[PDB]
């Protein structure tokens, strides 16, 4: 497929739409040019979804409760509003943790205010106050509470901030009101922002006057790793083998204390830029902590990341860096030797949220695969700016892709593998295209770091080369 | 580290010593974790009768609900109609979750659109979204019908669906003849099963309310079947099979069995099968209408009686022996078809299995949960098997339903130690299975966390989960099972007896300890 | 002691302290038992590669066989014919065992007589036994046919069944036209499956050998189906179902599905359904004859080809995807009927399930055993699922079969670590699952003792049994399952992927230990 | 039914048979008269089965291997001949034992010489010799070997005695040849006799002049308890609470050493008369040990038995006897109080092997049930002598009952419960008559002793009063 065929593909697909939608969707589809450093010349993003077109996008609540807050393991997070949102999100996301669930850790539980009509009509504020006391009674080892607003909270004019302040002062407890109602923004994205701002305003400054923390020159925090299938653990082990001290992870397997300690570190290491750049920038402004983006997907990016991180410290870390890289060389080399011959030349199309649609390209390339299309549900133009140099020339970019468009792009481009979410997976398997979940890792992982690259390789191979794909056509048809 | 010849995923990778050491250091360094002794103390406390008393006094806090919200049901109902797109008026976040929830249960595509209402729609509502949404959906996905429900944002803002759809037709966004049934589906009222009821009544109203003049009850010589919220493919299939075996003319109204089980043959089929518009239009001409799950089909019932003039029979869900018998006898009566030899034999096969298996089932104690009709059918069958349904939890149940179940329990010696709970959740159920331990749980996948909690107290306190219900996300293809009819009863019986025997084998597998009772023959 | 409100059977009664103390005193006082340290030392030794090499050098001793004797198969074959009494000429102890064996697997009555030959029959032979036996049987149980097989006593003393039955007719013990097909079924040759083949060829011979001159291949427009030794009711049923869906005329020759699944309706039916005598008499007029289990129907085959002149196609057992496809295309070719839309969809639903489940199945390692056709079908399907069938054991297998399975393994990457064993027993298999541990065993109930052995070494060495085969005595109603066709493949796929997920849930159920991987969604 | 009615039931049923069979079966069916002390004046037993009539009987191998020898836990029992017999009998009988299966205990294993045609034609003696060596290698902790002859062994002229002598001498090992070929006798019964004589000739004498074992005046053996579901254990505990020392159990959970020690006891307690009277008579003749029959089914018989046993000792044992009886009094009373009301007046028909058809009658009566019919597969006239006074006047007795007879009897008499074997169970369940397995205890038990009566009572109630029985009739018929 040439540049002209892809442009022509974009036009043919857009032909089904009514005029308003056609004009909008045209701006959200582009053929990559890696010379372009300003993505706003090439593609529009972070805009309202067109009604009725079967977007894959979620809401602010998903971005706040599902993504940023829900993983913090020693706090209780209240899905505040009707029962739906908390139930559908309950344990959907594999943000792994170590704890005693229901006792000191609460991640896979669903706490909810289960709004009824009387709550809609007369407000939920008295119910929330009562809820907080019932939580204190039945879950005494919780180290804080967050209140994750669902759609009705803001619409009915509830004042969760005042309940938070009053109940927080009464119980000497951090209670975080979060205005992540799903009607806000256009996607999960504004949920991230609101969530980061809630951390800033209600949690992060608690230890500003406390000088008891025994700091070292090598203290770092992992920012924006949600430990999907243990991803953060497989990252963290490398950073500590390189001689760093990982004081905090935000927010996979994260604790409230380690969030409160983060202002004491020397360097914030940002994996998910999209979801955590907001607090990262805050911490640099307020505490003078520098942050840097990294990438632990596949050996090339992990090596490059380890070197770049170590270069921020003294010779001794740079020396340990080289020892880590030497240690893992034979392991990732064995993975390449086994799997790259099984996957070389295979073509991949991705569609994921805010980070992975560019971040995983290097891992695919380490296995000799070619990402021929990618896109994001809710990325901003600063994400597409980082994407364009990572993707090949004349590859397809899609922002907030419709189900229709995705299906039609795939029918034409005929990738060997697709990597997307659960709403996509069954569609493409039926078309007989190998599919890997690139959110949940298909219940596998971790995929971060050197240990994760082995699993990623095994998984892409197991699916792409599976015997089931030869069988879809009955031998009599 | 990894050995390339045996790659370890998260389990068991993080049991390697270096990961253990590193996770200890994280805990001790930075987590300010409660001491293990105190975690153990609180855990022990959460298993006590004292904690259960505090737990059952909750008024405000819900923990681990066993229900979902209206529009989930409306979507499932809509999917049962031929080339129909479920369309939820309101916030798209809802629809991502509906689709995922069903995707994970059915392991199938689930098609559903939103009209992506945002904060701006608070000023003057969602009318423009409806207009562009309907137009865009129709053009892009080419359904023959769009079935509209609502998310809570749209309900709270008070959008008038009727006017909004009328105005969409008025300004030419969709053709006047294009079917757009709708229903208000407030998530803060009832649960997912109410959504199904509302959606269905909305569709039935749409197709019949205005064309009643020409309708003659009985004239099509058929029985209408309304299945309600149903997530086992086998249940749609067994009703059709049983009715075709009797030679009963029937219309199944809402039939997603085809669209939730399309073949993987190289093409994605967005639509398949489903109740036709022609069937919904002709439905008032049926002899009568049977509601398979009457306890969430109250609104449908009032409409079908009030408007179609059908004398809807008082039938329990056709689950287990007695209620399947009653369903078949009522269908025989309404249709004039005798029950054929084939169903009589299938019934006797079920009874045969009950005699074969009764000694292992006798006195076995169950905690169970689900939707009202499913829960009462299971309760009823358990009593038929001589099991004790000790803890009966229906989060979305109501007082009248609870009275009906209390009477079923009262009418059998096997009900003497049973309590029905309504408006209680799985954190409530957790307490009951610690304080008044049953042998097993029958529930959905959320039950696995209660099994985990019981095991933590000790192997002797573990209460194994038997997965029957919705959703089942941690096993594959159970959604293909059957729970209705003799077939369903036979599947349930088999699962129950074999769950008991698996557990007994586990407990008797200890060499020179308990394996004196590790019998080859059971 | 017992508390009347909670009566304890043997487990857990004998774990009371007073029974434990009593059993300790029995042991120490009178049993002269090897010290526990020596028992542990020998146990450990039986798990080693050294022990396995010694084990595999056995020539004389068989331990824990995975086969039965010929007349068991003869009986099952006989049962498949309308109002037929299986009659085993010889020793009555045999028949008590045959009946009990099948009673326990099918949990049904199994009707079978003996002619109760005693020591005295060694002088003369069993001629008077056959005369009185046939007369008595015919009078008492009123079968329309008596199908005669032999126990090893009768084979060793050399009783001529043909002459004995002929003399029974000549002397008026039974009417000459009363059908009495027979087969010699020596237990010391082959196995139960051989008995089935001998019994069936015997019956086929009886009804066709002397009346071929009027037969015309193709004239009845049907296909004969010979199922072989089959103990899943689903298998007879799925074959008939698929052929009816295809609109193919068929005769299933030996069909016990009715008499092994009679209703519990207040009467005992000694006989039900089965292949009619007319079906057998008319079988040579079929288009062709298909053998579902060719590796134990070799004698049948020679007769069908040799006398009926049917060109029996070279088909594998229709198990899994490729072989169900081939069976159906061959049936399409012979019958001229196209494979219908319904079987196409079903096939694609199976493929859909394979795509949904493939990540959990990939690379999973299995030890498995059973009869030749069943085993190779299971091997084939496992390879199609991307599983590794590492230890393949067929006690009653032969060299030619093995070469066939070796070629199936060679044609697949998934076969690289697989070894096929013939003439080896479950004590051999025990060694293999210790020295080269798979993830699971697929086998019959006898495998439970191997799971027990593996657990004793430790939890991380336990190899769980997945029960597929014959006999299954420690689970209820599995004999209702299906292993043939797409239906069978779907049932096997579901059992396999859920057995994996059940075991993963067990391993990850440890609070604050392994439950990081206790996912709600898999 | 009256005496006249039953006599005519017998005549109507017999009408179906040919002359020869009719005349024989007439002699094996009778109407009880409890006056009759000489059962040979009203019923024939222990005769050949009529060909083709579907006896329920087994063979002599079942009697020796399955019943007497197979339970002996620390020996290896070779099913010698073709593969069938060892396989059908493998772990079918719940003769329970404590041990490490495969290491020091072998009960649920199937060892066989799996004869092929070359063994039939040329003899199996060389194979048996090789087999014994292979056993010694792979099962070094076995404490002896029995050789259980299947049908072909005697027919082809094998000399297993010589092989046993030669290999026993070579290895200094007890190897017991047992001529229990199924062509021998007419039933399981001759197998018991052959097996008893094998114990006598090859095992029991081994320690005749060895006096290292320190006997007490309270030494007993349980003879003919096969520990079905633990029956022997439930019996044993009572004898030891009464101050006796149980030196051996024959042969449930039995060891070779406790068989060898048995001639050191003061009293042989015989439960199963039929199977083990032979060795009990031998022990009285040779060692002067008295034996007595007892019955531990139901409180009435257990109490009577305990008192009868204790009266053989001294006042100390008689005293503990009354102490045991006082202890279990409230327990069995609570069993009666709970279950007798649920079972009172119910009518039972039994068909079992050699003992239980009379022995369990008392347990039924302790629950107020009536045994209206009983019969044995392989009993002799001395068993019928013991039966006639236990059964009521004008009840039905049947010896070696045919399938046909049993069904027709049940149809006319319409018992509330049938207790029989696996070959009968599924017949009667389909006729809507509650059925309890009275060999295997339906995978339940034990039923011996006080602890066993509780389970027996629970079991009869659970089956007899089960909801499944009111459901056999389809409401539309
Ligand atoms: S937080 Fe974001 S959609 Fe950065 S909302 Fe989403 S666990 Fe995706 S591409 Mo699910 S911006 Fe994380 C994401 Fe990426 S939930 Fe996970 S996979 S790296
Ligand atoms: S030995 Fe006998 S047939 Fe006395 S061969 Fe049989 S374990 Fe029966 S009535 Mo099965 S003479 Fe024992 C018997 Fe009774 S196997 Fe058991 S129940 S008390
Ligand atoms: Ca699917
Ligand atoms: Ca049965
Ligand atoms: Mg138990
Ligand atoms: Mg106990």
**Angular region, A63: left φ>0, alpha ψ -120 to 50, beta rest:** alpha
For C165, which DSSP code? H
Any idea where the domains of chain B sit in the sequence? Answer: 69-214, 215-319, 320-363+484-522, 364-469
- Nominal resolution in Å? 2.3
> Chain C contact for A470, CB < 8 A?
no
Distances (CA, A) of C77 to C86, C197, C199, C239: 8, 8, 7, 17
> Chain C contact for B518, CB < 8 A?
yes
The C-alpha angle with vertex B55 and arms to B50 and B59, in degrees rounded to 5, equals: 140
Fold equal for C69-214 and C364-469: yes
In this complex, do A471 and C354 lie within 8 Å of one another by their Cβ atoms?
A: yes
Ligand lying nearest the CA atom of residue B102: 3
Q: Which of D230, D466, D471 sits opposite B321 (nearest CB)?
A: D471
CB D84 within 8 Å of CB D115: no
Distance, in Å, from the CA atom of B76 to the CA atom of A343, rounded to the nearest integer, reads 39
For D249, which DSSP code? E
Chains A and C touch (3+ CB pairs under 8 A): yes
Per-residue tokens: D43: 């019923």
- Is the C-beta atom of A191 inside 6 A of ligand 1? no
CB D423 within 8 Å of CB D406: no
Q: What share of chain B is helix, strand, coil (3-state, %, to 5)?
A: 50, 10, 35
Closest of D321, D308, D222, D293 to residue D262, by C-alpha: D222
**3-class DSSP state for residue A161?**
helix
Per-residue tokens: D408: 């027709």
* CATH code for residues D203-317: 3.40.50.1980
Mutation target for A interface from C328, C336, C341, C362: give the one with most A CBs within 10 A.
C362
Per the annotation, the verdict on A321 as an active-site residue is no
Distance, in Å, from the CA atom of C162 to the CA atom of B389, rounded to the nearest integer, reads 61
Distance, in Å, from the CA atom of A165 to the CA atom of A147, rounded to the nearest integer, reads 12
CB C113 within 8 Å of CB C180: no
- Write down the experimental method used for this entry: X-ray
Which atom in ligand 2 lies closest to the alpha carbon of residue D273? 4
- Is the C-beta atom of D354 inside 6 A of ligand 2? yes
Q: Whose CA is nearest to atom 13 of ligand 1?
A: A353
**The pairing of beta strand D396-399 with beta strand D29-31:** antiparallel
Per-residue tokens: C473: 């005595």
Chains A and D touch (3+ CB pairs under 8 A): no
CB A373 within 8 Å of CB A394: no
- Is the C-beta atom of D364 inside 6 A of ligand 2? no
> Chain B contact for D90, CB < 8 A?
yes
**Residue C400: count of CB within 10 angstroms of its CB:** 10
Closest of C469, C415, C402 to residue C442, by C-alpha: C469
**The pairing of beta strand A29-31 with beta strand A396-399:** antiparallel
**3-class DSSP state for residue B470?**
coil
In the reported structure, the alpha carbon of residue B30 is separated from the centroid of ligand 2 by a whole-number distance in angstroms of: 69
In the reported structure, the alpha carbon of residue C242 is separated from the centroid of ligand 2 by a whole-number distance in angstroms of: 47
**Residue C322: count of CB within 10 angstroms of its CB:** 17
- Is the C-beta atom of A356 inside 6 A of ligand 1? yes
Q: Where are the alpha helices (DSSP H) in C125-253?
A: 127-141, 152-157, 161-170, 192-208, 233-245
Specify whether domain A1-59+342-476 bears CATH 3.40.50.1980: yes
Distant-in-sequence contacts of A288-295, Cβ < 8 A, 24+ apart: A289/A263, A289/A265, A291/A223, A291/A267, A292/A267, A292/A268, A294/A269, A294/A270, A295/A271, A295/A359, A295/A362
What is D344-358 written as a DSSP string?
Answer: TT-EEEE-BSSSHHH
Which atom in ligand 2 lies closest to the alpha carbon of residue D226? 7
Closest of D48, D472, D452, D476 to residue D230, by C-alpha: D452
User: Which CATH number, 1.20.89.10, 3.90.950.20, 3.20.20.70, 3.40.640.10, labels domain B320-363+484-522?
Assistant: 1.20.89.10
Q: Whose CA is nearest to atom 4 of ligand 1?
A: A272
Distance, in Å, from the CA atom of B331 to the CA atom of B333, rounded to the nearest integer, reads 5
Q: Which residues contact B43 (CB under 8 A, 6 or more apart)?
A: A100, A102, A103, B456, B457
Distance, in Å, from the CA atom of C373 to the CA atom of C398, rounded to the nearest integer, reads 11
Tell me which chains share at least 3 CB pairs under 8 Å with chain D. B, C
What is C101-147 written as a DSSP string?
Answer: HHHHHH-S----EE----TTHHHH-SHHHHHHHHHHHHHHH--SEEE
- Among D65, D353, D439, D440, which is best to mutate for testing ligand 2, by the most ligand atoms less than 8 A from CB? D353
Per-residue tokens: B240: 């059709």
In this complex, do B61 and A135 lie within 8 Å of one another by their Cβ atoms?
A: yes
In this complex, do B351 and D471 lie within 8 Å of one another by their Cβ atoms?
A: yes
- Among D276, D361, D437, D439, which is best to mutate for testing ligand 2, by the most ligand atoms less than 8 A from CB? D439
- Among A68, A296, A355, A382, which is best to mutate for testing ligand 1, by the most ligand atoms less than 8 A from CB? A355
Distance, in Å, from the CA atom of C45 to the CA atom of B137, rounded to the nearest integer, reads 70
CATH fold of the domain at B215-319: Rossmann fold (3.40.50)
CB B203 within 8 Å of CB B280: yes
Q: What is the CA radius of gyration of chain B?
A: 25
Distances (CA, A) of B60 to A133, A174, B48, B371: 9, 20, 22, 22
Distance, in Å, from the CA atom of A372 to the CA atom of C32, rounded to the nearest integer, reads 75
In this complex, do D459 and B344 lie within 8 Å of one another by their Cβ atoms?
A: no
Specify whether domain B69-214 bears CATH 3.40.50.1980: yes
Helix, strand counts (H, E) of chain A: 20, 14
- Is the C-beta atom of D69 inside 6 A of ligand 2? no
For CATH 3.40.50.1980, the residue range(s) in chain D are: 1-59+342-476, 60-202, 203-317
Which atom in ligand 1 lies closest to the alpha carbon of residue A95? 7
Catalytic residues of C: 152, 156
In this complex, do C452 and B507 lie within 8 Å of one another by their Cβ atoms?
A: no
**Cβ density class D22-37: b for 16+ within 10 Å, e for less:** bebbeebbbbbbeebe
> Chain C contact for D151, CB < 8 A?
yes
Catalytic residues of D: 59, 62, 93, 192
Distances (CA, A) of C379 to A463, B396, C498: 21, 47, 19
> Chain C contact for D411, CB < 8 A?
no
Q: How far is A250 from chain B (nearest CA, A)?
A: 12
**Cβ density class A235-252: b for 16+ within 10 Å, e for less:** bbbbbbbbbbbbbbbbbb
Per-residue tokens: D20: 């020869």
> Chain B contact for C478, CB < 8 A?
yes
For B307, which DSSP code? T
CB B499 within 8 Å of CB C502: no
- Is the C-beta atom of D230 inside 6 A of ligand 2? no
> Chain B contact for D91, CB < 8 A?
yes
Q: Which residues contact B441 (CB under 8 A, 6 or more apart)?
A: B366, B367, B368, B429, B433, B447, B450, B451, B463, B464, B465, B466
- Is the C-beta atom of D271 inside 6 A of ligand 2? no
Which member of B75, B112, B152, B390 is catalytic? B152
Closest of D282, A27, D109, A423 to residue B106, by C-alpha: A423
Helix, strand counts (H, E) of chain D: 20, 14
User: Which CATH number, 3.40.640.10, 3.40.50.12160, 3.40.220.10, 3.40.50.1980, labels domain A60-202?
Assistant: 3.40.50.1980
* CATH code for residues C364-469: 3.40.50.1980
Q: Which residues of D touch B384 (CB under 8 A)?
A: 467-468, 471
Distance, in Å, from the CA atom of C520 to the CA atom of D263, rounded to the nearest integer, reads 64
């Amino acid at each position: 497929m040439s540049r002209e065929e892809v442009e022509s593909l974009i036009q043919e697909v857009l032909e089904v739409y009514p005029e308003k939608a056609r004009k909008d969707r045209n701006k959200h589809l582009a053929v990559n040019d890696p010379a372009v450093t300003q993505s706003k010349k090439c593609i529009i993003s972070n805009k309202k979804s067109q009604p009725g077109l079967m977007t894959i996008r979620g809401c602010a609540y998903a971005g706040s409760k599902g993504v940023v807050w829900g993983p913090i393991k020693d706090m209780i997070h209240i899905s505040h509003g009707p029962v739906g949102c908390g139930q559908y999100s309950r344990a959907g996301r594999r943000n792994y943790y170590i704890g005693t669930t229901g006792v000191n850790a609460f991640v896979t539980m669903n706490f909810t205010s289960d709004f009824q009509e009387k709550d809609i009509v007369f407000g939920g504020d008295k119910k929330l106050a009562k809820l907080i006391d019932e939580v204190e009674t039945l879950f005494p080892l919780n180290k804080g509470i967050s209140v994750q607003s669902e759609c009705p909270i803001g619409l009915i004019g509830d004042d969760i901030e005042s309940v938070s302040k009053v109940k927080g002062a009464e119980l000497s407890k951090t209670i975080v009101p979060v205005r992540c109602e799903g009607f806000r923004g256009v996607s999960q994205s504004l949920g991230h922002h609101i969530a980061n701002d809630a951390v800033r305003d209600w949690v992060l400054g608690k230890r500003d006057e406390d000088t008891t923390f025994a700091s070292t020159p090598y203290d770092v925090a992992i920012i924006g790793d949600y430990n999907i299938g243990g991803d953060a653990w497989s990252s963290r082990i490398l950073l500590e083998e390189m001689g760093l001290r990982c004081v905090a992870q935000w927010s996979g397997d994260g604790s409230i204390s380690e969030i409160e300690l983060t202002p004491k570190v020397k360097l914030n290491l940002v994996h998910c830029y999209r979801s955590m750049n907001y607090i990262s920038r805050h911490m640099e402004e307020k505490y003078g902590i520098p942050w840097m983006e990294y990438n632990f997907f596949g050996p090339t990016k992990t090596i490059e990341s380890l070197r770049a991180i170590a270069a921020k410290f003294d010779e001794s870390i740079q020396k340990k860096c080289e020892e880590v890289i030497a240690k893992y060389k034979p392991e990732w080399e064995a993975v390449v030797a086994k799997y790259r011959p099984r996957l070389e030349g295979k073509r991949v199309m991705l569609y994921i949220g805010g980070l992975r649609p560019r971040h995983v390209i290097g891992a695919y390339e380490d296995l000799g695969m070619e990402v021929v299309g990618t896109g994001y549900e809710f990325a901003h133009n600063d994400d597409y700016d980082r994407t364009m140099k990572e993707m090949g020339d004349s590859t397809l970019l899609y922002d907030d892709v419709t189900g229709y468009e995705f299906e039609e792009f795939v029918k034409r481009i005929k990738p060997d593998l697709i990597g997307s979410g659960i709403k996509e997976k069954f569609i493409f398997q039926k078309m007989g295209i190998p599919f890997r979940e690139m959110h949940s890792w298909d219940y596998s992982g971790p995929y971060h770091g050197f240990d994760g690259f082995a699993i990623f390789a095994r998984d892409m191979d197991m699916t792409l080369n599976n015997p089931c794909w030869k069988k879809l056509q009955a031998p009599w048809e | 580290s990894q050995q390339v010849d045996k790659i370890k995923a998260s389990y068991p990778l993080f049991l390697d010593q270096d990961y253990k050491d590193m996770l200890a250091k994280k805990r001790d360094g930075f987590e300010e974790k409660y001491p293990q002794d105190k975690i153990d103390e609180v855990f022990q406390w959460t298993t006590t009768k004292e904690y259960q008393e505090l737990n059952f006094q909750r008024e405000a806090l819900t923990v681990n609900p066993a229900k979902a919200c209206q529009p989930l049901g409306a979507v499932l109902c809509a999917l049962g109609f031929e080339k129909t797109m479920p369309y939820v008026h309101g916030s798209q976040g809802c629809v991502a979750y509906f689709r995922s929830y069903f995707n994970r249960h059915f392991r199938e595509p689930v098609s559903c659109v939103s009209d992506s209402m945002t904060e701006d729609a608070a000023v003057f509502g969602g009318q423009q979204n409806m207009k562009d949404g309907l137009q865009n959906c129709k053009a892009t996905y080419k359904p023959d019908m769009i079935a509209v429900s609502t998310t809570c944002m749209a309900e709270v803002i008070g959008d008038d669906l009727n006017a909004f759809i009328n105005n969409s037709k008025k300004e030419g966004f969709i053709p006047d003849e294009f079917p757009v049934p709708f229903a208000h589906t407030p998530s803060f009222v009832g649960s997912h099963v109410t959504g199904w009821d509302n959606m269905f009544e909305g569709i039935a109203r749409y197709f019949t309310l205005k064309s009643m003049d020409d309708k003659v009850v009985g004239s099509n010589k058929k029985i209408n079947i309304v299945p309600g919220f149903e997530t086992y493919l086998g249940n749609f299939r067994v009703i059709k099979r049983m009715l075709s075996e009797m030679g009963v003319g029937y219309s199944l109204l809402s039939d997603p069995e085809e669209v939730l089980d399309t073949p993987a043959d190289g093409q994605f089929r967005m639509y398949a099968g489903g109740t036709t518009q022609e069937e919904m239009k002709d439905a008032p001409n049926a002899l009568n209408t049977v509601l398979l799950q009457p306890w969430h089909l109250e609104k449908t019932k009032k409409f079908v009686e009030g408007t179609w003039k059908h004398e809807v029979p008082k039938l329990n869900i056709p689950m287990g022996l007695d209620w399947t018998d009653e369903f078949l006898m009522k269908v025989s009566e309404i249709s004039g078809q005798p029950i054929p030899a084939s169903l009589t034999k299938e019934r006797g096969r079920l009874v045969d299995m009950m005699t074969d298996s009764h000694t292992w089932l006798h006195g076995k104690r169950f905690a169970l949960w689900g939707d009202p009709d499913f829960v009462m059918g299971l309760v009823k069958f358990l009593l038929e098997l001589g099991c004790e349904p000790v803890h009966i939890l229906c989060h979305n149940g109501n007082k009248r339903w609870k009275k009906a179940v209390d009477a079923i329990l009262a009418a059998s010696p096997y009900g003497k130690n049973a309590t029905v709970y309504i408006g209680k959740d799985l954190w409530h159920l957790r307490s009951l299975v610690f304080t008044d331990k049953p042998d097993f749980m029958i529930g959905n996948s959320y039950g696995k966390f209660i099994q985990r909690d019981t095991l933590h107290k000790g192997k002797e306190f573990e209460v194994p989960l038997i997965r029957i219900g919705f959703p089942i996300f941690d096993r594959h293809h159970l959604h293909r099972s059957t729970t209705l009819g003799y077939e369903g009863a036979m599947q349930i019986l088999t699962t129950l007896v074999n769950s008991i025997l698996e557990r007994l084998d586990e407990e008797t597998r200890g060499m020179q300890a308990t394996d004196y009772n590790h019998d080859l023959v059971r």
